[PDB]
Design an enzyme around this catalytic site. Structure first.
Site, short mmCIF file in Angstrom:
data_model
loop_
_atom_site.label_atom_id
_atom_site.label_comp_id
_atom_site.label_asym_id
_atom_site.label_seq_id
_atom_site.Cartn_x
_atom_site.Cartn_y
_atom_site.Cartn_z
N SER A 46 18.04 1.50 -31.62
CA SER A 46 19.47 1.13 -31.69
C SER A 46 20.20 1.61 -30.62
CB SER A 46 20.07 1.76 -33.16
OG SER A 46 19.75 1.48 -34.29
N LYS A 49 22.82 -0.76 -28.66
CA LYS A 49 24.48 -0.92 -29.15
C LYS A 49 25.41 -0.15 -28.29
CE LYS A 49 22.39 -1.13 -33.77
NZ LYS A 49 22.33 -0.35 -35.14
N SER A 106 26.33 3.08 -35.57
CA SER A 106 25.04 2.52 -35.51
C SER A 106 25.07 1.22 -36.50
CB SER A 106 23.80 3.10 -35.45
OG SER A 106 22.84 2.64 -34.53
N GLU A 144 14.09 -7.17 -35.81
CA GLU A 144 12.80 -7.29 -35.44
C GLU A 144 12.73 -6.69 -34.11
OE1 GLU A 144 15.00 -10.35 -36.12
OE2 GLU A 144 14.27 -10.75 -38.08
N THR A 211 22.53 6.91 -30.08
CA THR A 211 21.02 7.21 -30.78
C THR A 211 20.37 5.96 -30.81
OG1 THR A 211 21.97 7.34 -32.81
CG2 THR A 211 21.69 9.55 -31.70
#
Ligand code: O2F
EC number: 3.5.2.6
Length: 269
Positions: A46, A49, A106, A144, A211
């Site tokens: 993540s 982002k 997130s 994915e 994170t």
């Protein structure tokens, strides 16, 4: 030179963890650095982002109405871990609100909507190339891109390139000043990183971070800008992976690696 002037026991830490730890940390005053596996590739998970939100802000410099544009979405957009966007399904959210949610919670539906707006994984990669990052690559769409397969370069970067790009976007000239401070403010408001880099940073220092946790192969990460009082800011990235699919990640190892990085730079904390 100024790299690893002081050795730190990163090897013992990663051996106890049972995998690999990658660290790059930059003292933006002197240019001194701490570097351990810093040019190896690790999955972004993540953590892409944060750079996605910076790419949105960059576009907003030439589209004055972009951030306030309302975006509506259907129930099919809501994927697991969309804690903010699920509360506005029936109303929509603005581009700026989607960006804040992607950084600070997130939020997965928010990130997917913004990735679509930018032209997909190749569009985010193009933004990173435009700031001089030749390492970053995003290849797949959400849920994915987190497969974290050993040896697979898709959806990876290096700790060094993450840190270098984070410095350019938060402290350098890659964004205009209002957009730069907005990016900093979103990172400072993150809610998901209290047990990672922030756990190594004294409470009286400012810090912003993003994170990532892939859920397989012991793969998790954090990057941050830290403002110790009375000296120049520090930029750092900490990434982990491990050889077996069912190996667990560790937040404590990320915090410990951040403490070693600050110690290596001679930052009293
Ligand atoms: C699932 C979220 C999302 C992630 C990105 O890495 C993508 C792949 O869904 N981003 C999160 C982030 O806090 O950064 C969280 S993972 C966090 C670590 N254990 C918690 C947990 O319940 N897990 C499903 C792993 C939350």
């Amino acid at each position: 030179m100024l790299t690893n002037l002081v050795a730190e026991p990163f090897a013992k830490l990663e051996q106890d963890f049972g995998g690999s730890i990658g660290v790059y940390a930059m003292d933006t005053g002197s240019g001194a650095t701490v570097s351990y596996r810093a040019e190896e590739r690790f999955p972004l998970c993540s953590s892409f982002k944060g750079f996605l939100a910076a790419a949105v802000l960059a576009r907003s410099q030439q589209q004055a109405g972009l951030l306030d544009t309302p975006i509506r979405y259907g129930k099919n957009a809501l994927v697991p871990w969309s804690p903010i966007s699920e509360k506005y399904l029936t109303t929509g959210m603005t581009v700026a609100e989607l960006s804040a949610a992607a950084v600070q919670y997130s939020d997965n539906a928010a990130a997917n909507l913004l990735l679509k707006e930018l032209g997909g994984p190749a569009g985010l990669t193009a933004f990173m190339r435009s700031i001089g990052d030749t390492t970053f690559r995003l290849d797949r769409w959400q849920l994915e891109l987190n497969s974290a397969i050993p040896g697979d370069a898709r959806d990876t970067s290096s700790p060094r390139a993450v840190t270098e790009s984070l410095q350019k976007l938060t402290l350098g000239s890659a964004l205009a000043a209002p957009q730069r401070q907005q990016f900093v403010d979103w990172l400072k408001g993150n809610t998901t990183g209290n047990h990672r880099i922030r756990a190594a940073v004294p409470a009286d220092w400012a810090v912003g971070d993003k994170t990532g946790t892939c859920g397989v192969y012991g793969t998790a990460n954090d990057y941050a800008v830290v403002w110790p009082t009375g000296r120049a800011p520090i930029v750092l990235a900490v990434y982990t992976r491990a050889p077996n699919k069912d190996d667990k990640h560790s937040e404590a190892v990320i915090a410990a690696a951040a403490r070693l990085a600050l110690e290596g730079l001679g930052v009293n904390g």
